[PDB]
Each structure stands twice: as structure tokens, then as C-alpha cells.
Amino acid sequence: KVFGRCELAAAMKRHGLDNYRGYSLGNWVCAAKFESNFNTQATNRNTDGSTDYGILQINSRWWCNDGRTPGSRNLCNIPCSALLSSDITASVNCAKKIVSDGNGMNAWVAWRNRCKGTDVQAWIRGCRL
């Protein structure tokens, strides 16, 4: 599923990401924009042989099982394919675990490089939330 901007904002809010670990909703929308262009089916993969999945490009090195990432973990307790669903629940629940892991949203390199410190509220401007 390719979400619209406000559509994704609303879905993220319903799933409890607004202000989760202190990160306002625009942070999450901005991260999703640059990770996946709002496409749940995005994959990419990594040099190391891991793969990133879904709207927030969550990595199989630590977070999900894909059967083809040697030595990896599955800390979210999910198949990586669950991260590609039109239903964002698995991506949200796993993102909550990632952002709680000590480096906050810096876990997403694209958030650090493209969203952090910017006017992220612009990503939710106009939306009915």
C-alpha cells in the first residue's frame, strides 16, 4: 500500500506514535517519507546481506526474521514480511521497540540526515488528526 501523507499521519496517530518517546508525529511521517516514500512494500538489500522492510525500512539484522540473514536476531518476534502489510501495526509495534533502544530516532539514518532538526511539523500540516 502507498499511503497518502495525511492518511499515514492519521494511521500512525491511531497506533500511538504521536509523541512516542517524545517524537512528534511529523518526525515519524518525515522518516517514512525518506525511508520508503510511504510504500509499505518497500525493500532494500544492505551491503552486509541484511534487508530493510516496509514503511520504516526496519532491518533483518536485528528486528525481524527473513531466513536469509546469518547471525541475525528477530527482536520484534515477526517475519519480515509482516512489515510489508497494508496494515501498519507490525511496523509500528516494532518501531516502538527500536526507538526505545537507546539512540532514539537516530536508529533511522535517514531521519538523522533528512529530518532531525528540520521543521517536521510541516509533514502533518493541514491533516485532519
Nearest CA to 54 out of 64, 40, 44 is that of 40
Query: Least Å distance between CB 75 and Cl ion?
Result: 6
Residues in the chain: 129
Q: Which does 55 bind (CB under 5 to 8 A by kind): Cl ion, Na ion, ligand KR, none?
A: ligand KR
Residue nearest Na ion by beta-carbon distance:
72
How many Å apart are CA 98 and CA 120, to the nearest integer?
Answer: 20
Which among 7, 18, 35, 87 is annotated as catalytic?
35
Q: For residue 122, how many C-alpha atoms fall within 13 Å in the half-sphere facing its CB?
A: 9
Which residues, 49 to 68, sit near Na ion by CB under 5 A?
60, 65
Is 101 annotated to bind ligand?
Answer: yes
3 state SS of 47 = coil
Query: In this structure, are residues 35 and 57 in contact, taking their beta carbons and an 8 Å threshold?
Result: yes
Q: Which is nearer to Na ion, 46 or 118 (CB)?
A: 46
Decide: is 92 part of the binding site for ligand KR (CB under 6 A).
Answer: yes
Catalytic residues: 35, 52
Residues in contact with Cl ion by the rule CB under 5 A: 5, 11, 24, 26, 65, 68-69, 72-74, 79, 87-88, 104, 121
